[PDB]
């Protein structure tokens, strides 16, 4: 169980850790989050009390170094930073623990929610989507645009998701226009899985990173990448059985976790109605279709 100490909390702020959040008052004696489960990626995330605009946060894995949070009063945000001095870091953490100035990652022992949402997400894959190679952690916010949103304007602050475009020479073989447009199996299986992602685990990792970025930061281009990656599987006639079974499980926990009140902006009516009711895989997502109908019958 690992720790992210905070130097201080000079501004009032709603702090997110994975699917949890805690309000901290201006100059409250808050010194961090302890008991963070080893084995998963985590996201620590912020929404300032004064400006409820720009949600922002850091993706990290505690195995990859000692990370802390320190407010920068020049740039006006909570920054993640790595402490390279192991003995200084342990000395900081132990002091704040003794003084009980840290909230405990409030995991119920039965509750596999974070594991289910991050099953295929790996820090190495996040650091290729969010390029900043001098840090072991990744910064995302509400406003960051995707490589794809840029084409249709600062490359260094971009989310580099895999570009998916159903009306592209990449998606459509010369001489198989109708076949490839109506049945995306070639695009899914040869171009994306074999060619670009190498396997379904990398494809699902990116889909789940896309969802979590949409959910935690209201990142619009993230939401578009999540839906595009669902649509590409559902619109394929030919999909390995294990991928359909896994997709059902992935989607169930994303829909289960979605705050009930954001489904209007976070869920794309056209895509979900097509995936569940019109597509090749209309009958192949029992769990997702049952939670979607019981929790969001308005959308459908």
């Amino acid at each position: 169980m690992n720790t992210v100490p905070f130097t201080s909390a000079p501004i009032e702020v709603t702090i997110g850790i994975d699917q949890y959040s805690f309000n901290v008052k201006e100059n409250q004696p808050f010194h961090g989050i302890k008991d963070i489960p080893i084995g998963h990626v985590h996201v620590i995330h912020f929404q300032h009390a004064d400006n409820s605009s720009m949600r922002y946060g850091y993706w990290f894995d505690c195995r990859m170094g000692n990370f802390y949070i320190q407010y920068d009063p020049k740039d006006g945000l909570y920054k993640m930073m790595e402490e390279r001095d192991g003995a200084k870091f342990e000395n900081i953490v132990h002091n704040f623990k003794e003084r009980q100035m840290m909230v405990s990652y409030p995991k119920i022992d039965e509750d596999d929610t974070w594991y289910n949402l991050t099953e295929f997400v790996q820090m190495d894959k996040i650091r290729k989507i969010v390029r900043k190679d001098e840090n072991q952690f990744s910064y995302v916010d509400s406003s960051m645009t995707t490589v794809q949103e840029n084409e249709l304007s600062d490359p260094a602050h971009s989310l580099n998701y895999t570009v998916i475009n159903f009306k592209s020479r990449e998606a459509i073989r010369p001489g198989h226009e109708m076949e490839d447009f109506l049945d995306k199996s070639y695009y899914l299986n040869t171009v994306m899985l074999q060619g670009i992602f190498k396997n379904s685990s990398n494809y699902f990792g990116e889909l789940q990173f896309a969802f979590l970025n949409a959910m935690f930061f209201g990142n619009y281009g993230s939401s578009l990448q999540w839906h595009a990656m669902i649509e590409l599987i559902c619109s394929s006639a030919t999909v390995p059985k294990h991928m359909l079974d896994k997709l059902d499980e992935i989607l169930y926990y994303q829909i289960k976790t979605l705050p009930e009140q954001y489904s209007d902006i976070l869920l794309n009516e056209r895509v979900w109605n097509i995936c569940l009711y019109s597509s090749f895989q209309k009958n192949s997502l029992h769990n997702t279709e049952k939670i979607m109908e019981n929790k969001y019958p308005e959308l459908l």
Binding site: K167, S168, R169, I172, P174, E177, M178, F181
Partner: protein
């Protein structure tokens, strides 16, 4: 975006463009089977590809053999239209290829876009205009060449005959949409008007009668009347 009455003069500028109409690609007669079920029998069709500026009609005849052993024919017809248009574009010299293709039916946009990926600078546009190109098969010489065809064939026509010698492309297109609207609303009445006088003939190399400017006014007047009569009936008003 969409071609409407607000940008109607764009049709007659010096940017090459083509209307595509797929409403006569897939044509059927519905009939009863011996066991009293229903069945369709395809007939020859055509793609109606028009330059509105010049009157150059590219009539791709769709022979019934293209449907043999194929499924979801009305879907396949959109894609086969977009294939043939894409083939026509590639067959034209660069300086003749259109900058815009206007489809008369929104269902042709995605098929045409996907077949034209190789041509990113050619704009595929819908139209809010209700164009009467469906009645193209009420023109006797076009109907004849489609129905006689024993194989896939492209036939080149000028749908304005020699009218551009005397009138502008705006006025030629207006005359043409009025004749087609008339043939579409009452085919019998429309054809009667066009051939009621035996002394006005269709030249071998033409589609419509050899009318003098005055006779065209009389004809256009008779076509307008015919369209209102029929409208006054449809709606009893």
């Amino acid at each position: 975006g969409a071609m409407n009455s607000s940008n109607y003069a764009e049709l007659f500028n010096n940017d090459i463009k083509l209307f595509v109409d797929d409403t006569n690609v897939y044509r059927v007669t519905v009939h009863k089977t011996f066991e009293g079920n229903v069945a369709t029998k395809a007939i020859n069709g055509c793609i109606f590809t028009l330059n509105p500026k010049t009157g150059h009609l590219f009539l791709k005849i769709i022979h019934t053999s293209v449907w043999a052993g194929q499924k979801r024919l009305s879907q396949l017809a959109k894609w086969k239209t977009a294939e043939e248009v894409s083939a026509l574009v590639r067959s034209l010299p660069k300086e003749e290829q259109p900058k815009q293709i206007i489809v008369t039916r929104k269902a042709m946009l995605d098929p045409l876009e996907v077949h034209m990926l190789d041509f990113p600078n050619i704009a595929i546009r819908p139209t809010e205009l209700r164009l009467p190109f469906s009645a193209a098969m009420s023109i006797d010489k076009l109907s004849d060449v489609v129905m006689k065809a024993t194989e896939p064939q492209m036939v080149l026509f000028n749908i304005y005959d020699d009218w551009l010698d005397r009138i502008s492309s705006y006025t030629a297109f207006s005359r043409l949409t009025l004749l087609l609207r008339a043939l579409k609303t009452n085919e019998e009445s429309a054809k009667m008007i066009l051939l009621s006088d035996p002394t006005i003939t269709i030249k071998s190399y033409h589609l419509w009668p050899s009318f003098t400017d005055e006779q065209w006014i009389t004809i256009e007047s008779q076509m307008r009347d015919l369209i209102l009569t029929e409208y006054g009936r449809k709606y009893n008003v």
